[PDB]
Symmetry: D2
Subunit: 332 residues, 4 copies
Amino acid sequence: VKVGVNGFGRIGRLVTRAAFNSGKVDIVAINDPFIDLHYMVYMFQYDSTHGKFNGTVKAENGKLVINGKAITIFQERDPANIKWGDAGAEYVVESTGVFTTMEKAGAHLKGGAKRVIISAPSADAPMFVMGVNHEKYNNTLKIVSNASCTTNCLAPLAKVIHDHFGIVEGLMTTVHAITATQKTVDGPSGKLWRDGRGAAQNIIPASTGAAKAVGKVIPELNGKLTGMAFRVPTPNVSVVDLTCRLEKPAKYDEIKKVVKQASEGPLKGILGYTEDQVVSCDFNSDTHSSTFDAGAGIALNDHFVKLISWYDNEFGYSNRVVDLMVHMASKE
Amino acid sequence: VKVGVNGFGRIGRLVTRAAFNSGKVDIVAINDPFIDLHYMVYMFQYDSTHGKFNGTVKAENGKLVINGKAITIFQERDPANIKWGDAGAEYVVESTGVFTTMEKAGAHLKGGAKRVIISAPSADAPMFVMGVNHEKYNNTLKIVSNASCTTNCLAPLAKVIHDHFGIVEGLMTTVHAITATQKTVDGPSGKLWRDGRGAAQNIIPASTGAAKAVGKVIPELNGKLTGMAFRVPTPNVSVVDLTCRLEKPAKYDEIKKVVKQASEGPLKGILGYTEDQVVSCDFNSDTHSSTFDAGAGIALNDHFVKLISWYDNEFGYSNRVVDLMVHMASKE
Amino acid sequence: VKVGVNGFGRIGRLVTRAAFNSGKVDIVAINDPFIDLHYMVYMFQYDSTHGKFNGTVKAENGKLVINGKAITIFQERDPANIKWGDAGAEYVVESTGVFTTMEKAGAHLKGGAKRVIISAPSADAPMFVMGVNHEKYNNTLKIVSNASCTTNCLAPLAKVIHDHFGIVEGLMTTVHAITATQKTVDGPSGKLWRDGRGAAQNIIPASTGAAKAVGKVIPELNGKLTGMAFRVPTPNVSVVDLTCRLEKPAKYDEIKKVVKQASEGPLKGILGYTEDQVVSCDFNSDTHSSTFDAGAGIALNDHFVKLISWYDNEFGYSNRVVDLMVHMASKE
Amino acid sequence: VKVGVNGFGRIGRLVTRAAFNSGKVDIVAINDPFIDLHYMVYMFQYDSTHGKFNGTVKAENGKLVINGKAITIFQERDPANIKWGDAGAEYVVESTGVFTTMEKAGAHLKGGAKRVIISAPSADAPMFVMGVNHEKYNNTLKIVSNASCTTNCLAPLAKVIHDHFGIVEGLMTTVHAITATQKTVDGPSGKLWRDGRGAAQNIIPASTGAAKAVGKVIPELNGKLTGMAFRVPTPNVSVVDLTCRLEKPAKYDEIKKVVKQASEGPLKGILGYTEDQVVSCDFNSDTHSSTFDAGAGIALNDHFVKLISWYDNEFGYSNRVVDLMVHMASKE
Ligand SMILES: NC(=O)c1ccc[n+]([C@@H]2O[C@H](COP(=O)([O-])OP(=O)(O)OC[C@H]3O[C@@H](n4cnc5c(N)ncnc54)[C@H](O)[C@@H]3O)[C@@H](O)[C@H]2O)c1
Ligand SMILES: NC(=O)c1ccc[n+]([C@@H]2O[C@H](COP(=O)([O-])OP(=O)(O)OC[C@H]3O[C@@H](n4cnc5c(N)ncnc54)[C@H](O)[C@@H]3O)[C@@H](O)[C@H]2O)c1
Ligand SMILES: NC(=O)c1ccc[n+]([C@@H]2O[C@H](COP(=O)([O-])OP(=O)(O)OC[C@H]3O[C@@H](n4cnc5c(N)ncnc54)[C@H](O)[C@@H]3O)[C@@H](O)[C@H]2O)c1
Ligand SMILES: NC(=O)c1ccc[n+]([C@@H]2O[C@H](COP(=O)([O-])OP(=O)(O)OC[C@H]3O[C@@H](n4cnc5c(N)ncnc54)[C@H](O)[C@@H]3O)[C@@H](O)[C@H]2O)c1
């Protein structure tokens, strides 16, 4: 399937790298009115977090050429003006962070795209997490959401725990890497006051809908989870901390066994499992959605436990966007 | 009361600063074999986290002289060799991190101190937290512990919540600033592997007895709390995230009211309360043990809630060590 | 003199703090379309770098009230629309970063301001550095620049060295704290590619005209200095490293004596002098423009030397903005 | 050649990595009293800065097994007690930081090593920089030093500049990543007070002999260079900023031409050249000694110029240790 990327940012660029690394997906067009062609060569080639691109990137005849694949470059603020159909882009990855509703994301369809994958939670577009509910996708859905990074970490874990022991209720904290929405020094941040405080100086509480959204991809958990976030001074890699009450008793060793088993079978590549003494950097460019840290979590008793799972918020999620597109392509 | 300080580190220096600032106790001696007298002047005068000392500090005639008051300086590796009595030190603050059992800390009694306050949890010394169980201290107790920074944050909050609504069970995460036990780049850390990894690069999970320890100071909560820590790349100020189930139902606004009332009355100066859109730097040099962050926390329902409280791990704790000594002196 | 502030950012806010320590200057109005009145209370009260404001600040009757003084609040994007005159603002601090020419900064004169102080270098407005050429100001100048932070650090040191020994030529590096122009993670930066790279991850080279500008305020040095910058991951406080060739020979101890003398005499409060083993955080909230670090520098020979001077780029600069206005007011 | 590593730290472990890429070098023994066998598996497998080891590592029958090769593990504090000869180690890399003199490093010969390569400057052991004076090595030298990371950056550049234009005199600053000698929070650093101050909080000036040491490896530059350092809050990658006066005039474009020619021929793989808008992270795990940054430097005139060159202080250096051993082995 031929793909367009709208917003060539952290997500858009790393989706682009994921497509090339793999390849039942072919990137054929990119729109970003804030990054011109020669600037795109530079932004793609060099990455502070994930290293230099391994391959060739060059501007040739007005196109962005990556490992010899020519890509059509647009510069449009309004998605309805991008000529996706002319460029052959069938699916568009909407990774700007400003077109997340059905109405706004649907502008791509006016440019000749057939489907849109919103790289963020959406107020109304249906949400999918690979490994949890992606089989619920069907051919009639032209606009879909791949949820958030944090939902993609929590939901595969919550699926396994709920399937085996039953989650009565749970409360989640994510300790999350800084993102582009933050500020280098104390400055204005509209209505999200805390988010405007200097990113590398602070632990910053933030709200997040990611735990409540698990109740949408796992409908039995509707109303049974919520949570909040702390942003902290690292440039990538995040961690979930799920505190839950279970219906059936589970010794921590039984939790470990069921999770490990899930990592080796049905959720292989989505949900990882470790007993090693890891820290966040050990998940740098890790492609899993969620990796359970057996050593880090703790039980109070057989029904009340705190479970820890790591996620490379940029790189795992960008790989999942690609995997969702491959899955949608298989149901055409 | 006349006080000696063993280990002139973050805690020993800030305890000294606290003492001089308030006049509540008199620092008359300091022992640190790794910091000679002229170096002590420099380490006291300049502080990256808390600013330059606002007062005078000089070396004169072999003495550290702070605001014109002379302090006897020792340089002994073995605490049994420190001549407290010669200096007139009555209480010793054991702030080295290496003498935390009653057997080890009791060495200070051989050179003439009368009582010892260990600036850390102790496997066997009686544990006190100001505002929670300090009234259980009595004159028979020559060696005591002021718990950990984390315990002094969680315990006042748990006291108020338990007294009003009943904590059935709870699980705590603390997101905690870097400390001296950590490493600048990946290096050896003995038994605690994860703590050797580069501190400013990583989110580092860690075990902590701080939640379990609340049960030592609030015996009704024995067996009912536990938790863990993440170390993150900030130089000071930490936060507790307490997920708990309550016996009697409590709307989040009732929780707020009850905590606010506590902070204004019997736990004033120990337990603070805010509704402001704060971040960690807002607690830089804050003397509270625990400041409840109303806006940051979230309830799932009337019996299951996540409560957030901030603590200056260096400066709140150091002030508590001074406060505990004042209380002990009042009982002689 | 009654003052307005256009751009209530790191410098706007700190200039406002500094003005409340003077009362040769009274802040009577602030404009910032991105910070509404109640948001201003918050942004002013809490400061990650320089701590909580130690006076009073509240919103009353649509005004910002600081230490009991009511301040008119504007919300205009176009400075020609700001009604300074109505609010009584005789001088306006232009601290937005986007109105740095005489043409653009003169828009304030339309709304009734009498003079404008641009908190940055200007292509065409006369530039002044306190202690170096501020006496060349006269009361016919309606638009003036206070130069950059870096020029305020270099120029006083260069003045002393040139006066005593003669600078034949110099090349300067500044190792500079992160600023609001930088990005939390790799993102777009228009024509300044390097500045888009993640700020907390990187040492970032940058061009700067600050050394060349010293030739505007010390005309004998025109054409004799230039330099560049590295941005590094600290939130505030910067350092100049001046490599210069001297006309007359100077042993490093003669340089120290002459700089020390200048710091005690005519440039007191502007140029500081230390022999202590300082680091950047020892200059946190330091009001000097430049503090020579005697220990840090190094001579190759009597005609070729590297001199080191620290500056709190936010706080020292903001104090100079106030000091310039005080000087300007004394000429009215 | 069979090699042992004393001090399995940042350098020892990355030399070990680089050796496993060589084929002319085989690691056969490692000594580190502070890292036991099972801990060495962990410390080698995971690396915060350079990523997970791309190979296999396990403990088997008391040996460390890397890529199928068994390595004897010692736990000795005194290097004269290590049985190098028995384990087959002909050369020892001395990478502890504490045995840098001929007399101290020479202890390894008592245990049966044949040659010692000190991973640091030595007061008396002959010093080699690959590409600059390595051909001055002969089989009579049983103890050698591979200099410092900084000298390996400056010396290749200085060779090219001096060869084409003549360096009359120069002064160097290096803006250097944190290293293991620094401290996470303000703490004791006996001799070197500035180095004890919190590493992630501060720009820290430091003395360095690295520029003076270029005159050992390039004797025509003896007495013509010196400099200093600033340690800044990044975990790896550093930059040299050389300010020099040239004998023959050199337009900046001619400097660029000569450095580029050198990078392409005789110093290929040692001295790199870029015109791209690079920042420090672009050199993460870059194996060059020195990469000239053409965009970053600046000339005042044809005889006085500031040249900028990057270096991964951990990874380029570690590769140079291996390249020096390969050269030495070639002459045996
Ligand atoms: N970074 C993460 O960890 C992460 C993880 C999962 C999902 N997300 C989501 O993905 C989205 C993008 O986040 P990001 O971190 O990559 O942000 P980003 O700021 O790095 O990238 C956003 C990009 O969109 C471009 N852009 C802005 N307006 C545009 C327009 N009108 N048309 C086309 N392009 C435009 C920008 O120039 C920028 O390059 C957001 O919805 C975010 O919440 C981010
Ligand atoms: N930093 C915090 O946030 C914090 C908070 C609460 C409690 N504590 C506890 O207080 C203690 C000190 O912690 P810190 O952060 O100040 O550590 P630190 O490393 O800054 O200070 C420890 C000091 O002890 C000194 N020392 C070591 N061996 C000694 C000996 N034999 N005799 C005398 N002095 C000796 C060191 O030279 C150093 O100056 C530890 O038990 C720690 O757990 C720390
Ligand atoms: N931060 C420093 O170290 C420093 C030092 C010396 C001088 N400077 C200079 O001072 C200026 C401000 O720098 P800063 O660091 O305070 O930046 P900043 O981004 O913190 O502040 C800029 C402020 O201007 C406001 N603004 C933007 N457009 C505006 C408009 N049209 N009208 C009114 N306000 C508007 C923004 O909302 C913001 O609050 C720049 O010229 C900068 O180069 C900064
Ligand atoms: N990190 C760099 O950027 C870099 C670059 C060039 C050279 N160097 C030099 O290389 C050396 C090592 O530096 P590093 O950064 O790897 O330091 P490091 O602290 O990571 O490693 C030193 C190792 O030596 C071990 N050790 C200590 N005492 C020992 C003993 N008696 N015997 C055996 N092992 C012992 C330690 O346990 C540690 O694992 C130093 O001389 C340093 O100056 C470092």
